[PDB]
Amino acid sequence: TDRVSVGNLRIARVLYDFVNNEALPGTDIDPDSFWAGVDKVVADLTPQNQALLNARDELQAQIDKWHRRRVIEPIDMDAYRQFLTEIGYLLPEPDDFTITTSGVDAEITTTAGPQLVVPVLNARFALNAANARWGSLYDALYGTDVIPETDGAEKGPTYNKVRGDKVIAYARKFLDDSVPLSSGSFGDATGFTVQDGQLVVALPDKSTGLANPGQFAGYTGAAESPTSVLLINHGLHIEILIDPESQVGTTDRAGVKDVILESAITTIMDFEDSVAAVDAADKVLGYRNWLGLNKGDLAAARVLNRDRNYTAPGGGQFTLPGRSLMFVRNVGHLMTNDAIVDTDGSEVFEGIMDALFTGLIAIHGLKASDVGPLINSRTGSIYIVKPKMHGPAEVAFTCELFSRVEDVLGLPQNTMKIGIMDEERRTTVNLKACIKAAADRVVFINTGFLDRTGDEIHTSMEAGPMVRKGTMKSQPWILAYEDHNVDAGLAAGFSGRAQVGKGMWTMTELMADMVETKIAQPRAGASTAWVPSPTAATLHALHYHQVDVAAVQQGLAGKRRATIEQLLTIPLAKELAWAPDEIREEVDNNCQSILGYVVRWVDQGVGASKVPDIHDVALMEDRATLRISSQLLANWLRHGVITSADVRASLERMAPLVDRQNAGDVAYRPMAPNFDDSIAFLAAQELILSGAQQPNGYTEPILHRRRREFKARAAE
């Protein structure tokens, strides 16, 4: 073997070397103490981890049997609730309480704004995401469909001034609505000066100041003719860049070159559903990127931005963070990984490893980067998103795991904070108890609605055929789940203490649609919501300038807008819901999305890909969207909506279409015509045909097996 013996563990040499040579130096942790701690924490917590997974299986078996024993009309909700209560699925609601989490940075406790999620194994994307704390509004408007490409306003190879003027006018309207002038419009501004600590905007006839002078936050250059003006609205910064010599500035009435928005306030560096990491080599690539981010010296085929310097309105130099405040999303409780095996050859639980290793690495972001000031949390916290938890015992386990890791690392208790994903049904219906179990560590709750939809289908798999995938988004259960999450957070005192977050916008090119509709999330009292790209971060920032999330949350206090009956409304399809063409469209759409995602996962180790759907809309796919598609098809197959020939025909029909979409790259192995020779095609087939048998419908068991299979065959 190429393994290292520490107690009962056998550690892959690449991981042992990375920890000793790269992660531990600078933390003052004795390497011998660290590895003995790994051994002891793994030994002590693995039994409870396994017991929690077995409890999931026990509950699901009882629910399967309950549906198979019934024949009655729709579900008697009264009997169903009583059943869930007796089996320990629906637990009592605890008494009211307020969270006690302390030592948390303002970006989380106070600032409302976008949250970006990026795969940590892609160093270039991760750097762009950390740098996405500031983003050009002109770039985001000019380069997307927010400004429609109508006659004369099209994008070309060179600058289209008619389009640029549309961008400029959009941004002037944004300034008027966000930081209004005492009189007149930013559209008519001819210049900016700082006078007696106040901003003066020259108009063609008069001069004017801000309606609220307190929104003037600073400037660069001389007050007499500043190079930029810094504004603030709803806690988010806006920077007007002034340069008449620039390509855009020469066309502008005031010499304005750009408007920069504070955009991705926080970023989640993802080890979970957006990356493919099936062995120690893969995990070390991710850990090393996470280390470079926390030490400040990650650099790609591109570097991290330093902080931004300003002058205060009344004089004085100050700084603003140039980087998004970073979370790391660990994997959840299910999977093991052979990066470490025990003496019997059993793989070690991956979530326990992630806590030890990402927590160790995060110490570097609490201290000075040599490449200047410390990178991440000035208040002394480590921010870990913990996904796919099922109910409050699983949250309490994560808390104990973090407590034990803090001890190994020499950190104060409760340094390691938890972003709780509300993305499994047994968490949703016990959410108050889940928050209480983490009441001194929780820094957000977030509706991971895609995983939640997969869990909805799997939990009630035996109840009957579910509605189509696109219908799910508007079903009663999910609207109740979204309001219930906000209600629980606000009642636990999250306002001013923790984030209340909502889910990802997946249509990466439909930015006009995103700007039109994602405003719903801050209007519902979410202090953050997930975006797929720095560009979408800048555009979603617009929504927090329009919506006073703090005011909305205060207006929601005390309201209880979702009942348990609503939360438990299973999304079963009605009698004769679909024509044959609608059933075929659903199968074809789901098969193409499964194939387009899985082929890059298995053959190239890419955990997130833009995959065009049956309507040619580019969707960002990750494991959760796969969980939905495979579970829905497994459910339709289980209840006779479609046949096994329908499934095979759809996969074979969509496969060469996916081959075409990928013809452009060197590492692509086509699936057609020899389908059963493609490990990726077989993986996609297995996710559907074995989907009903996977634990809680999770995709990782199959995906990890098939990726490792592919790696092994490519190695011989």
Ligand X SMILES: O=C(O)/C(O)=C/C(=O)c1ccccc1F
By the 10 Å C-beta count (0-12 exposed, 13-18 middle, 19+ buried), 155 is classed as: middle
Tell me which of 624, 632, 655, 682 binds ligand X, using CB under 6 A: 624
Residue 501 found at the interface with Mg ion (CB under 5 A): no
Q: Could you say whether residue 506 binds ligand X (CB under 6 A)?
A: yes
- Cβ proximity of 273 and 624 under 8 Å: yes
Q: Work out whether 449 is an interface residue with ligand X (CB under 6 A).
A: yes
The yes or no reply on residue 258 touching ligand X (CB under 6 A) is no
Nearest approach in angstroms of CB 7 to ligand X is: 34
Residues sharing a CB contact under 8 Å with residue 648, sequence separation 6 or more, in sequence order: 685
Beta strands in 581-642 (DSSP E): 609-612, 618-621
- x/- string (CB under 6 A) for ligand X, residues 412-441? -----------x------------------
703 binds ligand X per the rule CB under 6 A: no
Looking only at residues 618 through 677 of this chain, which bind Mg ion when binding is defined by CB under 5 A? 624
Q: Is residue 307 a known part of a binding site?
A: no
Smallest CA-to-CA distance from 398 within 381, 419, 412 is with 419
Using CB atoms within 10 A of its CB, is residue 28 exposed (0-12), middle (13-18) or buried (19+)?
Answer: exposed
Catalytic residue among 622, 623, 627, 707: 622
Q: 274 a known binding residue?
A: yes
Given the complex with ligand X, which of 508 and 662 has the nearer CB atom? 508
Q: Give the other-Cβ count within 10 Å of 159's Cβ.
A: 12
Non-local (6+) Cβ contacts of 614 within 8 A are: 585, 588, 589, 592
Q: Interacting stretch for ligand X, rule CB under 6 A, among 81-89, 172-180, 234-242, 499-507?
A: 499-507
Between 168 and 265, CB nearer to ligand X: 265
Query: How many whole angstroms separate alpha carbon 481 and alpha carbon 227?
Result: 47
Candidates 350, 422, 451, 586; binder of Mg ion (CB under 5 A) is 451
What tokens does 409 get? 């690392």
Nearer to Mg ion, 252 or 451 (CB): 451
Work out the number of other CB atoms within 10 angstroms of the CB of residue 232: 17
**Residue 596 is a binding residue for ligand X (CB under 6 A):** no
Long-range contacts of 1-4 (CB under 8 A, 24+ apart): 3/341
Give, for 261, the enclosing helix (H) or strand (E): strand 256-262
Instruction: Give the Cα separation of 567 and 338 in Å (integer).
Output: 38
Which one of the listed residues 308, 329, 425, 497 is annotated catalytic? 329
Q: Are 180 and 231 in contact (CB under 8 A)?
A: no
533 among annotated binding-site residues: no
Stretch that binds Mg ion, among 211-219, 422-430, 483-491, 567-575 (CB under 5 A): 422-430
Site string for ligand X, 597-616 (x = CB under 6 A): -----------x--------
Residue 622 touches ligand X, criterion: CB under 6 A: yes
Q: Cα torsion for 342, 348, 354, 360, to the nearest 10°?
A: -10
Q: Is 630 annotated as a binding residue?
A: no
> Which C-beta is closer to ligand X: that of 562 or that of 620?
620
CA distance 123 to 290: 9
120 touches ligand X (CB under 6 A): no
Annotation marks residue 676 as catalytic:
no
Residues 6+ apart with CB under 8 A from 412: 380, 406
In the list 359, 448, 454, 607, the residue contacting Mg ion (rule: CB under 5 A) is: 448
Distances 334 to 121, 187, 330, 394, 684 between C-alpha atoms, Å: 21, 56, 12, 11, 21
**What dihedral do alpha carbons 426, 429, 434, 435 form, nearest 10°?**
150
Structure tokens at 683: 């993986």
Q: 255 or 522, CB closer to Mg ion?
A: 522
Which of 239, 451, 455, 659 binds ligand X (CB under 6 A)? It is: 451
Residue 117 near ligand X by CB under 6 A? yes
Q: Which of 113, 135, 448, 465 binds ligand X (CB under 6 A)?
A: 448
DSSP 235: T
- Interacting span for ligand X (CB under 6 A) from 165-173, 370-378, 501-509, 597-605: 501-509
Cβ closest to ligand X, residue 423 vs residue 646: 423
Name the helix (H) or strand (E) containing 636: helix 623-638
SS3 for 378-395, per residue? CCCCEEEEECCCCCHHHH
Under the binding rule (CB under 6 A), the answer on residue 504 touching ligand X is: yes
Pick the binder of ligand X from 114, 296, 503, 596 (CB under 6 A): 503
> Which is nearer to ligand X, 478 or 620 (by Cβ)?
620
Question: What three-state secondary structure class fits 657?
Answer: helix
Nearer to Mg ion, 364 or 458 (CB): 458
Q: By CB under 6 A, tell whether 650 contacts ligand X.
A: no
Peptide-bond breaks in the chain following residues (C–N over 2.5 A): 301, 371
Binding site annotation covers 450?
yes
* 138, 232, 462, 541 from 131: Cα distances, Å: 17, 20, 47, 15
* Interface size with ligand X, residues (CB under 6 A): 17
Assess whether 622 carries a catalytic annotation: yes
- 423 annotated as a binding-site residue: yes
Q: 392 a known binding residue?
A: no
**Shortest separation between residue 455's beta carbon and ligand X, angstroms:** 9
Give the footprint of Mg ion on this chain (CB under 5 A): 423, 448, 451, 548, 624
Q: Which residues are annotated as a binding site for Mg(2+)?
A: 423, 451
Q: Which residues are annotated as a binding site for glyoxylate?
A: 329, 423, 448-451
Give the footprint of ligand X on this chain (CB under 6 A): 117, 273-274, 423, 448-451, 503-504, 506, 532, 608, 620, 622, 624-625
Q: Which residues are annotated as a binding site?
A: 117, 124-125, 274, 302, 329, 423, 448-451, 532
Catalytic positions are 329, 622
